[PDB]
Design a protein around this nucleic acid. Structure first.
Ligand SMILES: [Fe+3]
Ligand SMILES: [Fe+3]
Length: 911
DNA sequence: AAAAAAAAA
């Protein structure tokens, strides 16, 4: 039966014309063939073809065939009738009432039509292929279950008339894709990756410009030759689609370590070790763990290892995962200049974007941009509009972003196959591994498991990391590589980690090689004085600390001779108070005071951070800008601050964090450009702690952020040391390990029990969130996107919402400032009162993250933005916090949600 | 009671 072109696949946006289902099908086939050849990493074609146990050319054709069958389910009365169409010649299959999606039809039809071409009826291959294609809008469905011997009919495909056309179309794409034979073998995780591929094919050839063009040259009839021609014409056009979307591979030539960093004069201990010992080890897929301090150039080490693992696996793509948006912003810049220098300066990639992947990237004026428009004229690595979209970010050839963007691949959620696919062709590098908590850790573990089975190499960077965590992460990777999980009797892969140190895991044979194994000698780092740690008891007034006496004593030498010092507090109110205390004291004269926590407007925090890393940081010490200054802060000090302080005062915290904090003490001493006042004899950490009145007691505010047992364990650990200073990095790992491993450090058995149960809560909630282990998804993709009864989180806990303070006078008119000069925008200044990106930028610059709590259940009408803001994705979910201002001009504490709020210019948000 | 992230075809 010659096929009927009357059946459509697209209408909308086409100016009254419709695009025939055959044509869209072949476009998709052609798009997949091109993607397979010009987009996929060489080593991913190799992994995919191995699963299917056939050659790359056959694999590709199979895949092109499948992709051209994705919308076969549209060929039904239920879909076709949505527009005007003459179906007089096709009686039967009357509307069932089911309202069943075209992608579900596809998966319901294919299992029972595919055998007519060679596929095994009831076969594993047949089932997966159908299920995968049914998942093409991001949701997988169950295998079709049926009770009769006529499954086609049982599922609604009962018209012989409609059935010939469904078969004509099946044979048409089969013919155009070279009639490939069915593969012998196919498996879940492979199929899930191919699905992402079929999705990217649908998306690319669905762009209105592409469709409006193809509409000029539709085939004349449904003849084989007209259809062969359409396919070929579409083949011709797909590479321009890759160039326009920014998707071309970025390949970097092999080089030595010094060739790759020519402005690096002295290669480091770490660096010399890795570059010397790893190339022999990197023979194929595998994991490298590197644990080392700051200032040891782990960054340059990782780039080099990534290129090694890259070449070995035929994976030129990169994804670098960062703990924060700020650090991802920094690294994206770093990675860009590296790529500029490294790629052949003659042949710049002008149609290959290096993407930045996080939720605040759109509002980045550097990154965000301001069709075949300007093809081959963009700046190399520049962000493309296409790659701004949706869940496309991980399809960029190189990308840097939050670890969260990688974790979303293994969460039960729509289009997680897309992110799996985008990751599958890359080398993935996760930085700051020691910073992922138990919940994130179970997610990182399922990710590692899935990368392992997909042959993607992984570099894990960490500061000092507990051996149990290191073990978990390498065990998961290995579990994926080898196709089965660990036994209770099987010996652990990592029983000790050293700091500094590194480790390599071969996916194939499962062998773990430590650095100590290949050189007995320890790796040399920057020599530093041992860190002095001193416990100072602090009096307690009304369950809180009276830091008064102690702050006076320890800071007095600073008031005389100068120097930089930092006071770290466990909560915001505590930091807010301490700043008030030193505010009043310093009023009696010299020296500078600063305050940083999370509760400042975005612009003001970027401001405070900048003048702070400026004064205390490397560039300030090198510019002679370092003052002759006291920082008050919360755990913001823990991430991403270039600071060098002469003294640090911290509340008690888990040693891991207390050691991380103390990384600021004399951070840049080796560079003898730095003047330390006389009283600064040693690098020293003063740990504050309540004076007790038999297992240590701590303020409730502290035990709300850290587990009491953990505090107790750390206190005991440090007391036991009797004033002895900490050799860095010599005693570091020991302390990290023992604070958990040593049970005599926990005298309060009830609290230690509550701590382990809390961690059990975290791991278990994560275990519910993630997709199945690759071995559980072998013959069935359905649990990848299955959930019932809300979006699943990449981080544990209640989360935050951004708030926007506005101000009211006694009318009351509403203003954005306390002066009441800048009016509150009901509308934004764009044509037709619509908000621009610039509007959203200047607005989001004033917002503040607030921790979720009871207050959010008690909001009213005047806490919600106007009708107009409901339009903008960026402004929609904001919460307004009113601030009364008197006619005299004073700003008053103002009720919202059952408490009072006050935005102070020096202390930020108070409640 | 910290910090941290987070419309497609
Ligand atoms: Fe579709
Ligand atoms: Fe489609």
């Amino acid at each position: 039966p010659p096929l009927d072109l009357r059946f459509w696949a697209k209408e909308r946006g086409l100016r009254g014309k419709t695009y025939p289902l055959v044509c869209h099908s072949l476009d998709a086939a052609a798009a997949a063939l091109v993607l397979w050849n010009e987009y996929l990493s060489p080593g991913l074609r190799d992994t995919i073809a191995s699963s299917m146990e056939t050659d790359e050319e056959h694999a590709g054709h199979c895949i092109a065939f499948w992709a051209g069958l994705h919308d076969i389910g549209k060929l039904t009365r239920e879909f076709q009738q949505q527009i005007a169409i003459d179906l007089s010649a096709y009686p039967g299959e009357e509307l069932s009432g089911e309202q069943r999606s075209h992608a579900a039809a596809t998966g319901k039809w294919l299992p029972f039509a595919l055998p007519s071409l060679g596929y095994p009826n009831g076969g594993l291959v047949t089932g997966l292929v159908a299920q995968m294609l049914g998942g093409h809008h991001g949701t997988f469905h169950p295998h079709p279950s049926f009770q009769s011997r006529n499954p086609l009919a049982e599922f609604g495909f009962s018209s012989p008339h409609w059935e010939k056309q469904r078969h004509a179309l099946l044979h048409a794409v089969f013919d155009a894709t070279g009639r490939p034979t069915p593969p012998d073998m196919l498996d879940g995780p492979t199929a899930s990756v191919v699905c992402g591929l079929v999705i990217l094919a649908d998306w690319l050839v669905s762009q209105e410009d592409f469709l409006l063009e193809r509409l000029t040259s539709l085939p004349a009839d449904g003849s084989a030759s007209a259809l062969r021609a359409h396919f070929e014409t579409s083949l011709r056009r797909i590479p321009s689609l890759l160039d326009a979307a920014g998707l071309r591979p970025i390949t970097v030539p092999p080089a030595t370590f010094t060739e790759s960093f020519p402005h690096l004069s002295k290669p480091n201990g770490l660096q010399a070790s890795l570059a010397k010992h790893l190339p022999c080890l990197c023979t194929g897929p595998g994991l490298v763990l590197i644990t080392a301090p700051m200032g040891e150039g782990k960054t340059e080490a990782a780039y080099h290892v990534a290129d090694l693992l890259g070449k070995a696996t035929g994976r030129p793509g990169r994804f670098l995962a960062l703990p924060t948006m700020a650090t991802a912003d920094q690294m994206h810049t770093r990675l860009k200049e590296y790529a500029r220098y490294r790629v052949e300066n003659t042949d710049l990639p002008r149609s290959s974007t290096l993407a930045l992947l996080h939720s605040m990237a759109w509002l980045n004026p550097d990154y965000a941009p301001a069709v075949l428009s300007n093809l081959g004229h963009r700046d190399p690595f520049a962000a493309t509009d296409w790659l701004m979209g949706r869940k496309r970010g991980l399809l960029a050839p190189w990308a840097v972003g939050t670890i969260d963007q990688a974790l979303m691949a293994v969460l039960r959620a729509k289009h997680n196959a897309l992110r799996l696919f985008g990751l599958a062709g890359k080398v993935v590098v996760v930085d700051e591994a020691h910073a992922v908590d138990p919940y994130m850790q179970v997610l990182l573990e399922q990710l590692l498991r899935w990368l392992g089975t997909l042959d993607v190499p992984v570099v894990l960077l960490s500061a000092t990391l507990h051996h149990s965590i290191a073990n978990s992460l390498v065990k998961a990777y290995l579990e994926g590589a080898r196709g089965r999980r660990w036994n209770r009797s099987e010996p652990q892969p990592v029983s000790e980690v050293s700091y500094p140190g590194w480790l390599h895991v071969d996916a194939r044979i499962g062998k773990v090689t430590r650095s100590s194994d290949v050189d007995p000698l320890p790796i040399a780092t920057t020599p530093r004085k041992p860190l002095e740690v001193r416990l100072v008891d602090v009096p307690v007034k009304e369950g809180a600390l009276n830091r008064s006496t102690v702050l006076a004593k320890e800071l007095t030498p600073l008031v005389k001779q100068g120097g930089c010092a930092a006071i770290i507090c466990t909560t915001v109110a505590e930091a807010q108070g301490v700043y008030d205390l030193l505010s009043q004291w310093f009023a009696t004269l010299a020296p500078d005071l600063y305050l940083l926590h999370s509760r400042f407007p975005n612009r003001q925090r970027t401001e405070i951070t900048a003048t702070i890393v400026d004064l205390f940081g490397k560039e300030g010490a090198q510019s002679g800008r370092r003052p002759t200054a006291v920082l008050v802060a919360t755990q913001v000090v823990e991430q991403s601050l270039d600071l060098d302080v002469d003294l640090m005062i911290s509340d008690l915290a888990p040693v891991s964090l207390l050691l991380q904090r103390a990384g600021r003490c004399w951070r840049h001493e080796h560079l003898g450009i730095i003047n330390r006042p006389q009283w600064a004899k040693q690098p020293e950490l003063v740990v504050l702690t309540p004076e007790q009145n038999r297992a240590p007691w701590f303020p409730r505010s502290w035990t709300s952020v850290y587990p009491l047992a953990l505090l107790q364990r750390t206190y005991t650990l440090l007391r036991r040391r009797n004033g002895a200073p900490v050799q860095i990095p010599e005693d570091v790992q020991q302390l990290v390990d023992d604070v958990y491993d040593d049970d005599s450090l926990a005298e309060d058995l009830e609290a230690d029990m509550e701590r382990m149960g809390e961690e059990l809560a975290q791991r278990g909630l994560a275990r519910n969130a993630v997709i199945p282990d690759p071995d559980d998804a072998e013959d069935n993709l359905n649990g990848l996107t299955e959930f019932s009864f809300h979006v699943l989180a990449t981080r544990f806990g209640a989360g935050s919402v951004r708030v926007l303070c506005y101000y009211v006078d006694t009318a009351g008119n509403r203003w954005l400032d306390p002066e009441c000069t800048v009016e509150f925008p009901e509308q934004g200044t764009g044509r037709e009162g619509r908000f621009t990106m610039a509007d959203c930028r200047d607005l989001v610059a004033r917002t503040i993250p607030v921790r979720m709590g009871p207050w959010a259940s008690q909001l009213t009408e005047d806490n919600h933005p106007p009708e107009a803001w409901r339009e903008s994705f960026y402004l929609r979910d904001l919460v307004l916090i009113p601030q009364r201002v008197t006619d005299e001009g004073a700003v008053l504490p103002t009720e919202t949600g059952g408490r009072e709020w006050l935005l102070d210019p020096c202390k930020g948000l108070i409640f």
